[PDB]
Amino acid sequence: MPKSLTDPKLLKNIPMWLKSLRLHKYSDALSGTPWIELIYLDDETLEKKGVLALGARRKLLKAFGIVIDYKERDLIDRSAY
């Protein structure tokens, strides 16, 4: 469900955004990257950011391309940008 994964409130709070994934722990190394520069990463590059775990980066590839499937079409709440 996209509400809490496509939301300005979460998209600018990497910790509570990653909490929708039940991860919420990469923010220690990843909150310096806003969702708009972020979702554009990949498998192994999230890991150079410190997603030092496939079942965090692949789970992020989920999180990313759902928001991509709305962002690449301007369907987000417009204040997330």
Within 10 angstroms of residue 9's Cβ, the number of other Cβ atoms is: 12
Range of the domain at 12: 1-81
CA distance 54 to 51: 8
Judge whether 67 and 39 are in contact, CB under 8 Å. Answer: yes
CA angle 29, 49, 67 (to 5 degrees): 90
Nearest to 32 by CA among 10, 9, 14: 14
Judge whether 77 and 6 are in contact, CB under 8 Å. Answer: yes
Q: Tokens 């997330």 correspond to what residue?
A: 80
From residue 6, give the alpha-carbon distance in Å to each of 23, 47, 52, 79.
17, 23, 24, 11
CA distance 42 to 51: 11
User: Would you state the structure tokens that stand for residue 59, as one six-digit string?
Assistant: 């789970």
Please state the domain count of the chain.
Answer: 1
Nearest to 13 by CA among 37, 33, 43, 42: 33
Structure-solving method: NMR
CA distance 80 to 66: 15
The domain that holds 11 is classified in CATH as 1.10.150.50
